[PDB]
Amino acid sequence: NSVQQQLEALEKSSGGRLGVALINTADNSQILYRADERFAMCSTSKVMAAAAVLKQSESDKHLLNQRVEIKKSDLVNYNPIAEKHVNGTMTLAELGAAALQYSDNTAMNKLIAHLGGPDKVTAFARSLGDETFRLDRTAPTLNTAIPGDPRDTTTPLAMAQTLKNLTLGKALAETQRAQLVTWLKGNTTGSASIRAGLPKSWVVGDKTGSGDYGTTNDIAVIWPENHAPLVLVTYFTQPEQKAENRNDILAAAAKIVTHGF
Ligand SMILES: *C(=O)[C@@H](NC(=O)/C(=N\OC(C)(C)C(=O)O)c1csc(N)n1)[C@H](C)NS(=O)(=O)O
Numbered sequence: 001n002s003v004q005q006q007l008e009a010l011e012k013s014s015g016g017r018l019g020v021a022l023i024n025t026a027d028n029s030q031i032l033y034r035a036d037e038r039f040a041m042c043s044t045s046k047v048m049a050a051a052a053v054l055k056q057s058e059s060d061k062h063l064l065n066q067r068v069e070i071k072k073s074d075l076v077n078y079n080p081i082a083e084k085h086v087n088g089t090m091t092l093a094e095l096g097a098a099a100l101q102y103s104d105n106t107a108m109n110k111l112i113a114h115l116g117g118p119d120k121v122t123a124f125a126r127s128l129g130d131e132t133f134r135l136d137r138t139a140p141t142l143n144t145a146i147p148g149d150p151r152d153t154t155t156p157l158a159m160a161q162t163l164k165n166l167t168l169g170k171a172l173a174e175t176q177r178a179q180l181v182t183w184l185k186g187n188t189t190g191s192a193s194i195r196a197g198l199p200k201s202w203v204v205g206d207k208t209g210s211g212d213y214g215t216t217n218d219i220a221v222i223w224p225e226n227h228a229p230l231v232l233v234t235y236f237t238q239p240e241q242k243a244e245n246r247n248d249i250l251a252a253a254a255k256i257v258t259h260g261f
Contacts (some may be wrong), residue, residue: 019235021156040145042209105139108225130156197254214243
């Protein structure tokens with residue numbers, strides 16, 4: 001069957017709401033599925049906050065090396081990296097790395113506090129042409145992912161275009177661009193999501209995100225071995241609050257749309 005029908009069948013059987021947006025930079029073609037609908041980003045929004053910090057460094061060559069104090073009071077629900085540097089310091093380059101690679105929520109909160117609140121992260125998204133992205137809360141409350149709640153949401157299509165600009169396009173300067181890709185490529189939390197649906201040979205840099213309502217997300221940039229890069233967004237959410245997180249569904253969705261590449 002077609003790509004569309006397989007996703008509908010996957011959604012109908014999963015008992016949830018599935019969002020997909022793939023961009024083939026080869027011909028700028030698109031595979032869409034509920035790509036104009038709002039989903040809760042969860043911890044995928046961390047790519048924006050880090051990118052916002054990277055953009056500042058284009059005008060300040062001493063910003064990323066700037067230390068940041070990590071108090072015991074700054075710790076929240078999940079932070080495997082920041083818990084090690086209590087009563088110590090971590091540079092923004094380390095905060096940025098931890099936020100994306102290990103999904104450290106404290107590091108994420110340090111980047112926002114530095115920028116000047118979630119509104120500053122949103123204003124940064126606007127400068128890139130993204131009229132859809134919005135960030136209203138810090139971590140971990142930004143992962144509530146309540147149905148119908150517009151806070152901390154964006155559409156699959158908007159993020160794919162922005163993520164494409166950030167890693168392959170004109171959003172950042174080259175040095176800053178290569179740094180973001182380096183971080184995404186070194187992600188340790190997405191082995192079971194989109195990567196599990198692709199050939200193991202393909203190079204992949206992604207950012208996952210999990211929250212309540214079985215909300216399970218993954219945004220990724222893909223480099224084929226003999227083709228132009230791909231940009232894939234896979235959002236998924238369920239109607240009941242304490243649903244299980246389904247990364248296997250994101251793995252299935254990636255294999256369905258990437259079928260042929
Ligand atoms: C971002 O999405 C962030 N998610 C969370 O911290 C929450 N849960 O994650 C854990 C690992 C605890 C889980 O078992 O689901 C969460 C649920 S509700 C809420 N208000 N926060 C994590 C850290 N990032 S991710 O990309 O690794 O999933």
